[PDB]
Amino acid sequence: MKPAARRRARECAVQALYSWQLSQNDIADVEYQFLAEQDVKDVDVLYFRELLAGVATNTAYLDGLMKPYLSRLLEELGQVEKAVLRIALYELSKRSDVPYKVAINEAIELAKSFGAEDSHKFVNGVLDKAAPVIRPNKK
Numbered sequence: 001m002k003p004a005a006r007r008r009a010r011e012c013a014v015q016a017l018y019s020w021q022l023s024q025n026d027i028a029d030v031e032y033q034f035l036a037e038q039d040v041k042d043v044d045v046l047y048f049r050e051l052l053a054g055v056a057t058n059t060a061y062l063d064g065l066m067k068p069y070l071s072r073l074l075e076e077l078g079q080v081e082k083a084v085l086r087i088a089l090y091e092l093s094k095r096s097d098v099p100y101k102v103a104i105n106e107a108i109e110l111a112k113s114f115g116a117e118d119s120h121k122f123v124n125g126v127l128d129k130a131a132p133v134i135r136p137n138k139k
Contacts, residue, residue: 009035009048010087011106014114016052017083021075028052054090065089065130078123081115085126092134099139100131 009032016031023030032049034040055062066089071077078084088110092100104127111123132138 007043008040009043009045010091011084011110011114012040013048013052013087014080014084014110017086018080020083021079027056051090051094055086062086062089062134065092065133066126067133068129069126071126078111078115078119081111081123084110084114085123085130088127089130089134092131095135100135100137101128101139103131104128 012035013031016034019025019034020027020031029049029052031052032045035043035045035048066074066086074082074086085107088103088106091098091103091106095103104124107124107127108120112120115123
């Protein structure tokens with residue numbers, strides 16, 4: 001148990017989100033299967049598998065966060081990055097013990113190291129607008 005590790009899964013899921021577009025396989029099991037495959041530090045993510053189902057039955061719900069930020073098209077924006085932020089939207093709802101504004105800090109991260117550069121800062125703003133939706137707590 002090290003504070004330096006906050007469970008890759010979350011951020012790792014974006015990669016699987018990318019596989020969905022190209023693979024188009026199942027979805028709930030497929031995304032998280034990536035974690036189990038190629039031995040990703042051997043970590044129990046079976047429960048994480050269920051998390052994708054939410055998007056599969058609440059994708060439009062997640063759309064509410066992006067509602068304010070679309071960028072012409074979701075498929076156009078950075079494949080992985082767009083996916084990275086997509087899961088980030090749920091992060092606000094499933095917020096274990098973290099606020100909404102704090103999640104914004106991850107945006108750039110999940111769009112600077114999990115995707116591409118140049119247009120990384122723009123990703124942060126998406127979370128700013130998309131964050132204050134799933135949770136209208138307005139800290």
